[PDB]
DNA sequence: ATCAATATCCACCTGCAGATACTACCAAAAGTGTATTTGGAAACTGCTCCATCAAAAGGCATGTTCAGCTGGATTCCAGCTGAACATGCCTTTTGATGGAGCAGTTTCCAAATACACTTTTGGTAGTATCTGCAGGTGGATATTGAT
DNA sequence: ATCAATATCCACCTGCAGATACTACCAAAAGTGTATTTGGAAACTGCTCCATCAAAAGGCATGTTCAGCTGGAATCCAGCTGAACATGCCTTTTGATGGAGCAGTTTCCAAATACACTTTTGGTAGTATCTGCAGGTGGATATTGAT
């Protein structure tokens, strides 16, 4: 499968210089990881993401997932409500925060910008025929 | 006396003078453009009417037009056309 | 990991390619108007006698006919290349028309 | 009357139609085939054009009749009215 | 003091005429208020798209006026429009220059 | 379910019984025939409506139906179908 | 047509296979229903002449 | 979350589909091609079926949605309602 | 022992599978594949039984027709084996590509 | 030419799922009568666009020659596909449960239709008028073909 | 590589057919304002079918082996298509003429619609019933492939 990684960060969905994963076509910024990596002191060798590392750890066997998750929920007896939650967090590649859409839609004058930025009806608009302006009359 | 022949010449000319402010157009090209507009209009209206029939509704709304656009246009044309239609409807009802 | 982020004669086939370019640059009609008009009139006459045609009607027919034949020749050329030839033959026309569904 | 006229579609015209299609070498027996297929296509279209015309109770075949007869066979044609 | 509907929506295509064509076209028993607005918006969008492509094709040909050849080039050179108008013949539009690889001399 | 699903089963069975007296028909075949009847009906009706729109008419008449039958069916089928339709209409109006 | 095709197969009842065999064996009916798929209809038996032995 | 599931269209099934088409000898590389074309056809039909379904504001895909999505591509299907 | 020459059983299979009307793909793998494909247009979808049956019917009809066209393009080139370029030509002429 | 070996079909029984009626019955949908508007059929008429003739002149089609290159046939050879076993796995079923989702009923309420005016806008003739472009000419340039 | 011969492209120039443009003008139609009716949205409900398991049974898919036949490459050769030249013939253009057919205008009347009432009827459900067929079993035999 001689694939190539995406051209955008898997976490913030933006562009830049990415540390890439070999197994999967994901790519991440350096500060968009957990924990953030120093761009100079980068460990060479085989870098895998959280998801592929979880897969190779469980050897792609989900009967072992049954095993480890049952043992985990047996151990975390103090907070048994947050047991399964506390077990799933370790299978996800990092993300950035974006408000749920049931919160943004309570205020109708509020619109998500291009890169997930705030806009509140005081934004004039981007200039479309000002691409036509670089051409001009 | 012979009747009037409505067409889309003037609106096509307005759109052209918006995109390319200094290029004209021929007359056979304008005929091609009128035929194009009529064909696409008929396609979308027929699909919307079929949709309203299937669901036992008796009204064509912007929802039917939007679904017909999604069914008829390919790929990114659909995304951009839906954006344009939604923006225009929102501006129309805000007034 | 990655981190990847003695009279002059042209050799047979030259004028063919020159003509191909010349007629793929142009946009005119390639048949003469008068014989095509007579053909259309003969056919329509054996359909329904005492007919009349506007000029634009025969022009539309000529445009549609030529577009049809050009498309058919493109498909025929692909079917000829498929059998490792350069010459188009009637069996290629028959194959293209059968696959398109126009005959069978 | 108006009989023959199918040989009016000469061999140079068919060679031109083939050159516009990208053909480099042409056989000797494709002219008969092309005449046959042109005749078939023309009959199929003219039958419908005349049907429309005579339903409208006219004697002149309009261009709209032709574009309708073409549209009803999946051969839509832009630039002649409609 | 009577504004138009296309001016109220910010369009160039006519909303009243499209509304009338929808009404008298035998499509449904009733027609909403925003159906003509939506339809005019998408018609104007497609018109502008194809006209921009054709104007570029006309400029790179050293001309100042669009002809059917330019419309044909613009349509056939784009993928989505070639899907949309794949079964359409443009009168006096010509074809796309294309010679197969095995025919060229070597 | 209160809703009723009108179909053409009984009429197709009458036709079958007069054509082939002692031959039954399966349920899947009856569904095939139902789809066939609906398809041909809507084809003819759509063509009739079109060629009534072209001529600036409002009524769909026997003439529109006859022309749609001539446009949609192949030669021998169209000839026999036109014969049957005219025979039915002349028997009807003189009743 | 379908009833004849069924009786030629020594049966009493019509099944979609018989409708398919009747449609695809006629010329004008096949032209009227050329773009139609019939459920559980099968296909028409024919083998090309060059595929046969010898 | 279902994965791969395309190798479930086994090689004997494709050989059977070819035998019903009249094919006498089959290559080694046509199984990949057949899987590709089946996947393309299925996506093109299912997109439209789901569009109809979600316009009707339902969560279940009816058979009528499928026959409509098929009819809108010139693949009319008799025997499933309609 | 008793062997059949290459091609005999192929003709037998052609006759046998042209005489029948049953489906040729298994139902459960096709159902899984259809669900996985639809998983990309909308999550949490339900299907009726008849919907999947209709999809299977249409797909099998499509593939059989394509194989007929492909066999034609193979016999055109003085061959008996069908090859991927045959499929590509048949689909190009049809207008799919 | 002979013969064993399969695989296919022809003949017969049987249990059963599907086809065939019947009453109910029951909406519910179609036929009957009537008053009304209106859209399509007749008659007239003007005028426009089509068919016919004509001529003349040049551009295109036709027939011939000669030769080069392509299509078709033959040989050979390797490798790729098919046919037959032998395991094993995963599809089919069928039985049961959970439960989400879809179809039916009632309100009501927001939205589309119908009608009368009035101003605007888009279209047609007439006439106008610039101007981009098509036609003609020469000059330079790139490409082709035989040494 | 050299060089000579053609075909194509570029730059310049000129006339004219077509696109931009009012103006009249003007007639059609779109937008505005009310009152009415009706269709679609929201809540509730029940009951139906779709998802999820379980548990065998066995029928199909997978991997291996072997061999034979087909696809692909190389040679050769005839024949058929192309390129070029001379000849003539027939298409195209310009122009006028007759005249038939089409589109607009007025009249008007036969027909389709809308409403209300009564009567078949055809569609679902039991509800029952029965028989045409799918499956199974034996035997004849038609074809294949190795002798
Ligand atoms: Zn990032
Ligand atoms: Zn990874």
Author numbering:
A (entry chain E): 255 to 391
B (entry chain d), F (entry chain h): 30 to 124
C (entry chain e): 1 to 5, 37 to 135
D (entry chain f), H (entry chain b): 21 to 102
E (entry chain c): 13 to 118
G (entry chain g): 65 to 118
I (entry chain a): 38 to 134
What's the paper's own text on this?
Here, we present the cryo–electron microscopy structures of the budding yeast Rpd3S complex in both its apo and three nucleosome-bound states at atomic resolutions, revealing the exquisite architecture of Rpd3S to well accommodate a mononucleosome without linker DNA. The Rpd3S core reveals a compact architecture composed of three modules: a Sin3 Lobe (Sin3 and Rpd3) and two modules involved in the nucleosome binding (named “NB1” and “NB2,” respectively).
To explore its natural working mechanism, we assembled the Rpd3S complex with endogenous nucleosomes and resolved the cryo–electron microscopy (cryo-EM) structures in three distinct mononucleosome-bound states. In three nucleosome-bound states, the Rpd3S core exhibits three distinct orientations relative to the nucleosome, assisting the sector-shaped deacetylase Rpd3 to locate above the SHL5-6, SHL0-1, or SHL2-3, respectively. In state 1, only the H3′ tail extended from SHL7/-1 in its fully extended conformation can satisfy the distance to the active site of the Rpd3 (left). Around the active site of Rpd3, a fragment from the residues 1 to 5 of H3 binds the Rco1′_PHD1, which is consistent with the previous reports. Furthermore, our cryo-EM analysis reveals an extra density for a peptide with a long sidechain extended into the pocket of the active site in state 1. Together, it is most likely that the residue Lys14 of H3′ has been griped in the active center of state 1. Besides, Dong et al. reported a conformation state (Rpd3S_NCP 167 bp/MLA) similar with our state 1, consistent with our opinion that H3K36me triggers recruiting of Rpd3S to nucleosome but may not infect the conformational change during deacetylation.
